[PDB]
Symmetry: C4
Subunit: 306 residues, 4 copies
């Protein structure tokens, strides 16, 4: 897999659509040196620092990182990366992991406020383990379905993993989904359906949008999640239960281990993600970090006025 300045990039073992990007040891060391003056707390309080750490990392890769991240994420044939930095691979370096993921995400867009943490990222710990039963699979879905704005990317980092069996990230690229055409050509694929937010501590209003939509070239994209979609009647409800089964039993699903220090960064429009079951263990300890946001990048394109 191609050799770039400051990192290497190779196809994963689960699929050619998922590329593995690894920052070299030298790059990692220099980046950590160069962002040491800003604790994670500074990035939380001053959002411009999230972009600044991104600039520092991209400059360390001779400005080849930003364009490669964008090309990969916007490429319909790919759209997903598994990213890591040599030397960042233990729970003790959680702050460095956050800085690294923040730098990468802010070269391609901006991470949105997360209601679970009150910050631009959220860290979650699973230990001492309906929705949190270890034997339960978290079904494949897209993020951001209960708000008006589109979530373009999902970032999921493994911060810690102790006594963990299973729990791989599940992924499904729409073009690997064998039932795509059947569901996409159904009239219900284009009908606006109600999507309702969870608890919501005084934060929302229901939104309406179809389960499928199209990209700029007319190819199918999805905005689906079983828990938040609210079928209005028996017609919508039975169809969605069939859609759900068609997605969950798809032969195109990928099962991707995400070792400590690594993170998945995927295009949320044509990739769905979920999580496999895992075995309970008294000393199990799993810590994750997530960021979700929109893409924001430059291109030669039209404008009006001056």
């Amino acid at each position: 897999g191609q050799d770039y300045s400051g990192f290497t990039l190779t196809p994963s073992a689960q699929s050619p659509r998922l590329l593995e990007l690894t920052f070299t040891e030298q790059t990692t060391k220099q980046f950590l040196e160069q962002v040491a003056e800003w604790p994670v707390q500074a990035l939380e309080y001053k959002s411009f620092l999230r972009f600044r750490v991104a600039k520092i990392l991209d400059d360390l890769c001779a400005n080849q990182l930003q364009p490669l991240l964008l090309k990969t994420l916007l490429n319909r044939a790919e759209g997903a990366l598994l990213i890591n930095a040599v030397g960042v691979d233990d729970v003790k370096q959680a702050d460095e992991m956050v800085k690294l993921a923040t730098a990468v995400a802010h070269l391609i867009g901006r991470s949105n406020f997360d209601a679970m943490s009150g910050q631009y990222y959220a860290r979650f710990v699973v230990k001492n383990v309906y929705l949190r039963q270890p034997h339960r699979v978290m079904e494949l879905h897209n993020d951001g379905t209960y708000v008006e704005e589109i979530t373009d990317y999902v970032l999921m980092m493994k911060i810690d993993e102790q006594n963990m069996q299973g729990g791989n990230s599940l992924l499904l690229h729409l073009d690997d989904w064998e039932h795509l055409d059947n569901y996409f050509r159904h009239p219900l694929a284009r009908r606006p359906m109600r999507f309702a937010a969870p608890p919501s501590k005084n934060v929302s209003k229901d939104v309406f949008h179809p389960v499928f939509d199209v990209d700029q070239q007319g190819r199918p994209v999805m905005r689906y999640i079983d828990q938040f979609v609210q079928p209005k009647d028996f017609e919508e409800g039975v169809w969605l239960s069939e859609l759900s089964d068609a997605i969950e039993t798809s032969k195109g699903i990928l099962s991707v281990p995400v070792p400590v220090g690594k993170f998945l960064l995927i295009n949320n429009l044509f990739w769905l993600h979920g999580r496999d079951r895992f075995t309970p263990h008294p000393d199990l300890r799993r810590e994750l970090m997530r960021q979700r946001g929109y893409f924001a990048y430059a291109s030669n394109h039209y404008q009006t006025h001056q």
Copy 2:
């Protein structure tokens, strides 16, 4: 009473307008078998499963259940069912009772969010007993009067009953109400009045609508409840107190025992419901479950475009 595939249907002892629908033992056993993979918690989280369990039950009745439920509920001369399934009749099977009621309701419509439980249904326990005094009758009324959208059906299931004397459901079909014409022809019957929600934990705004309205054929329907209607002056207030007395002392009221495992499912537009007084007992235990929603079904009717 007619024999259908998977159930029987006979007129109640309180009125020919109230039909009793009983699912046979075989049907019940097969339904429970076929929905065992989904705990009630799964139905709570994924609303399409509520419709799926309905499909499973209707398919078990050779698709004769859905049409019969609809015909009965939409029929002005009837509009009410008392439903049960042979073998489901003890508090220990509360989850099965919820699944059964959910299946039936979602063949004819969709159950709305319930603010008391935060779910699509609510379970309530009365034990160790102004509004909760056992000697007090809960006056006849319609549900959904403080919101803009119309509540078409009310579902009330008895989950448990121990040392309970009295407490029958009270019902009043508008066409059995001897004072209907007198109140309906009064000008105040058509005046929009203010209706205000209870406590409301940051959830509402007052709504305005008349106490009476009409169905598609021009027959009287009601949207009334003594607690939430808010007469603006002495004219409205005295008239409503007379209306209230005319309803509560009506000779057309039905008193219907609802044994454990059974549920009333009524058309909320032309049926009012309430609850009779019951005697306090140190070891009294009464558990109810409710669902309220709108009808949603197919018919050959007009549409525009393609």
Copy 3:
């Protein structure tokens, strides 16, 4: 003072503008008999009962009560009543006091929701005593200044009084105010000023209205309170501090003792009210009840359509 059916009416000792209305012993006894089936809790839950108790009391006075209350409250030369019922005069009869005041208020209008109690009336107890210092006078003001809708009447009942020295209700009829013309003819009298609600537990938005306004005949009326008016600058602020002093030192102020069982019922548009200082006492106990609302009554007047 005139003899009516069921009550007597005589001018107060503080002013001919304030009339004292006393229900006879027979009237009181019959009213209490006739409203015994409804606890105060029933009136709280079913607002039509507030009007029904009013009807019962007015019918006991051969329908002469409603017209007299209205004529008095709407009469610019009067506009205030001090009301009591023979036999209702001890804290033990607080429920009867609430019923009586409720009956009177609902013959002339409707009492609004009170945020302090969550009900249509509020009861307050002062004991073990900046705003609650006993040596502090509560300045004269009008109620309802921080909402858009107009509050036409204020009702203040004394429920209990033990070891209480001072604390009389203060009243000021605008036509007894010697500085009325000076302030009313100032340009700031007609300038819309900002009024802001207290704490507000998620309930309001600021409102704007002038400190003075006019009745239907062009006579001055006021909508003023020192605590909630919010002068936007030094011009408004200095003028309002002068207005405040001109009102508080007015020679037209009345000081009215309100014995247990009695209540003031005043027109809030041209009467301002406040409360005099009182002496602290370890065993002091003062309990008040208030209701505030709008007038709603019939008159021969124009309408459109049919």
Copy 4:
């Protein structure tokens, strides 16, 4: 420095733009005498009293105070005062300090509600010491950036200071900022950016406005704060991080000690303020008071109608 009636005014040692205004001992004594009838609690409850105390102080200076405060604050070459009153200089006189600052502020405008205290001013105590680390500089910024309305002035008073080393107020007048022209002429200086409020306990909605704007003569003014500005992408984020560094390392920054009893009163449009680091000490005690508001004053200018 000029001698006025009741006070003296001289240029500070940090800059000729910052004038020091000191009320004489006689003025101070007479003012305190004349406002003794109103506790601070009275000013909190009745906003017109804030203007009244201002009138009392200005009248004591033969009405020369109001015009001088305004001329100084509106003068682009100055715009900042350091104010004190002889005899008010110890934490025990905190109430007198509040009254004094209130009087001054309300001669030139009105202080806005402060969400931290729920009052028109807020008092804060720092003792037993990311944002509250003593070694951390609070970056230079303008107040009021996350609301639509403009904050014209910032008032910062030192109420108490014990065992305090460092912690000076930092100030930067835009015309002393050597990089002003570079940043002001950049296209991003005029682009509306998103500004988001902190926690907010059910109080806001995001606002959009550029980081720079212009005064009535076209001279640069700023509305900036690193914590609340929310760059939407890498372009905005990198530019703002450069702006931030250009401001924080400016050679035009002033470092102003604010002794107990003194207060800074600055024009928030062309002055930025911050706070220097201070050394932790077990017995450190620092108490501040702030007020923020808009200017409101008279001038000969046009109007329409009558």
